[PDB]
Amino acid sequence: MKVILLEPLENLGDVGQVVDVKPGYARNYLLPRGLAVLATESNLKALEARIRAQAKRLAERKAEAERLKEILENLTLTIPVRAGETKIYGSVTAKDIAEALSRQHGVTIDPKRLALEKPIKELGEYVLTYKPHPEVPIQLKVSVV
Amino acid sequence: MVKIRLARFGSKHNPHYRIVVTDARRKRDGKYIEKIGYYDPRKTTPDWLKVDVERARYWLSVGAQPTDTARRLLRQAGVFRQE
RNA sequence: CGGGAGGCAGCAGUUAGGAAUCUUCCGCAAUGGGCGCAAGCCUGACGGAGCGACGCCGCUUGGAGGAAGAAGCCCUUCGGGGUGUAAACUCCUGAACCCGGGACGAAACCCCCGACGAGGGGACUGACGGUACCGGGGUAAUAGCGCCGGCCAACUCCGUGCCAGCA
């Protein structure tokens, strides 16, 4: 008796799994408790259709992390802080780094998917990273004026 | 001039005022002349407002401006009302 | 080259000193203040957020079984004794995270009836914040410091030899 799963369980689990059981088991537990459905081709083909959708649909927003790595991974920022020497008077949070970058080139960024703890407050040279999954570290230059 | 208005008490995120008569030049929560009521603007009780209406009448009778947001509340306990 | 400019013991910040003491943040929505008949304008006061076990309070790193008692290490009268139900292992609960929904604080000023009054009715407005909190799903998931001669609660082995050290 071929059936497709939902909630994973013991000795038969992961959703989409297609497994054979004894009809009694199917008819009096799984199907009624809603822990499976019949392996009809009716459903069996609509399962492949759920995968072929979600699976490749998700590699759109993986190829879209690279459609934005291939542009900022190299490009430089340069930030005009009013400092004195090595130390700065104010700081430089993301609300600026994400911001400046947007109006310096036209690029929107989440100030949250960065890679920053403390807000710099220190003149020099850095390159922090970005997110999600496989990543893009953006390149930034502090300054004076 | 001399006034009727609200002075914070309570805690953070727990507003809790006392209706009170005072010189305007005082600091918000400073020394006041006299207490006449209290008021919980979260109404977390059957008593979320009280007023010695008797007295409220006195201070008005001898010249005293209440705040906008104070006036509301003395009206709402019928101090102005004349039958 | 005749003369000019400045006074953070206001908010935040730099420097110096020192054992040592924070953000160049958000908002006038709430309260309070100034001017204005009013609409409203200003308010680093205030209402909030950020940083620090600095303190007080609450909460977690698991619950129930489980050997006449694994190994490892320590003692030993070499029979054993100790860590110790502790662990392994078995079920059962489900901090974090995940998806959804999401405030109270805000009813006045102002507009209509009455009279711009007493009284009645009607509308705008939330920085914190998609944050608390509610509902569904959901992984066994940080421990360290001080002391064990008497005062003073907790003893045995080795090392050391008025040295090294403790107080």
UniProtKB/Swiss-Prot annotation, chain A:
Tell me the InterPro entries matching this sequence. Answer: Ribosomal_bL9 (IPR000244), Ribosomal_bL9/RNase_H1_N (IPR009027), Ribosomal_bL9_bac/chp (IPR020594), Ribosomal_bL9_C (IPR020069), Ribosomal_bL9_C_sf (IPR036791), Ribosomal_bL9_N (IPR020070), Ribosomal_bL9_N_sf (IPR036935)
Matching entries from Pfam families are given as: Ribosomal_L9_C (PF03948), Ribosomal_L9_N (PF01281)
Q: What's an example Gene Ontology biological process for this entry?
A: translation
Show the GO MF annotations. rRNA binding; structural constituent of ribosome
Q: Does the keyword Ribonucleoprotein apply?
A: yes
| Superkingdom of origin organism | Bacteria
UniProt cross-references to SUPFAM superfamilies, sorted A to Z: L9 N-domain-like, Ribosomal protein L9 C-domain
UniProt KW keywords: Ribonucleoprotein, Ribosomal protein, RNA-binding, rRNA-binding
Keyword Transmembrane in annotation: no
The record's GO CC annotations read:
ribonucleoprotein complex; ribosome
Instruction: Provide the function of this protein.
Output: Binds to the 23S rRNA. Extends more that 50 Angstroms beyond the surface of the 70S ribosome.
Q: Name the family the entry cites.
A: Belongs to the bacterial ribosomal protein bL9 family.
- Subunit structure as annotated in this protein's UniProt entry: Part of the 50S ribosomal subunit.
- Put simply, this protein is called Large ribosomal subunit protein bL9
- Per the UniProt entry, what species is this protein from, by scientific name? Thermus thermophilus (strain ATCC 27634 / DSM 579 / HB8)
UniProtKB/Swiss-Prot annotation, chain B:
Gene Ontology CC terms, in alphabetical order: cytoplasm; small ribosomal subunit
GO BP of this protein: translation
One GO MF annotation is: structural constituent of ribosome
Looking up InterPro entries in the UniProt record yields: Ribosomal_bS16, Ribosomal_bS16_dom_sf
- Gene3D superfamilies from the xrefs? 3.30.1320.10
Q: Which UniProt keywords apply?
A: Ribonucleoprotein, Ribosomal protein
Q: Which segment of the chain is annotated as a signal peptide?
A: none
* Role of this protein: Binds to the lower part of the body of the 30S subunit, where it stabilizes two of its domains.
User: What does the record note on quaternary structure?
Assistant: Part of the 30S ribosomal subunit.
Q: Which HAMAP family match?
A: Ribosomal_bS16
The UniProt similarity line reads:
Belongs to the bacterial ribosomal protein bS16 family.
User: What name does the UniProt record give this protein?
Assistant: Small ribosomal subunit protein bS16
